[PDB]
Amino acid sequence: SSLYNSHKVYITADKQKNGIKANFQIRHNVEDGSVQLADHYQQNTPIGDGPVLLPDNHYLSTQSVLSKDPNEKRDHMVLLEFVTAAGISKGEELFTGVVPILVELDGDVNGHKFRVRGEGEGDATNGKLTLKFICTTGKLPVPWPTLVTTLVQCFSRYPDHMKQHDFFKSAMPEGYVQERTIFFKDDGTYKTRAEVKFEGDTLVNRIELKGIDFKEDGNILGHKLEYN
Q1: Which positions ≥6 away from 114 have C-beta within 8 Å?
Q2: In DSSP terms, which residues pair with 108 in a beta bridge?
Q3: Three-class DSSP category at 201
Q4: Which residues 6+ apart lie within 8 Å of 188 measured at CB?
Q5: Domains parsed from the chain with CATH numbers
Q6: Ramachandran region of residue 113, left (φ > 0), alpha (ψ -120 to 50) or beta?
């Protein structure tokens, strides 16, 4: 536990697929005080074919807050994110105000199938967003914390001198495809495909997620994380 807790998402351009790839590690605290590594490998490809801002090597800086809603009785997660870029087109046009967000997730983990819906709003200029997530099929079979990365980087606050490295906004509203492989040390793997685009003016992240080789007693299937 540190007080100022930034996770850095390292972004390198992929001239190859006209997109970007990314690499970072996530850490989850376990109840017994140890730590679960979760290695992320990410691929992002534009959906249209229009001009999109390929960038130079920078990183995103992310802080997450996870809370509950004392009223709400379903299995849920309230989340605030605070993202801003660092290291030194105009899809950026709609990211001027407070934008509505819908997030839909279809997921299979070792056969345990589930969905998650989420709504809220983001504010790219302040690099902030709020979202309430409900598990619309009941209990979540994995810990909420492990889904956070999978559950809209277009909302990062890009400083003025980096404004041309905002691939995410550039490729809007045709949007982009986000794919991650996520390796949990000594346990299973997630694969994710997601499409992020505008449907109306609300912003939508629709996701499929498959979860392979988990230990039905490991930290994930065993809900052994600090946020419980």
Answers
A1: 107, 135, 137, 138, 140, 141
A2: 113, 210
A3: coil
A4: 109, 110, 211, 212, 213, 214, 215, 218, 220
A5: 1-228 (2.40.155.10)
A6: beta
Q: How was this structure determined?
A: X-ray
- CA dist 145 and 31 (Å) reads 13
d(Cα 42, Cα 222) in Å, to the nearest integer? 26
Q: Give the residue carrying structure tokens 């041309």.
A: 164
Residue 209 carries which side chain, given as an amino acid letter?
L
With CA atoms as reference, report the closest residue to 72 among 133, 129, 142.
Answer: 133
Residue 21 corresponds to which tokens in the numbers above? 């790839």
- As a whole number of angstroms, the distance between CA 221 and CA 131 comes to 24
**Chain Cα centroid distance, residue 140:** 18
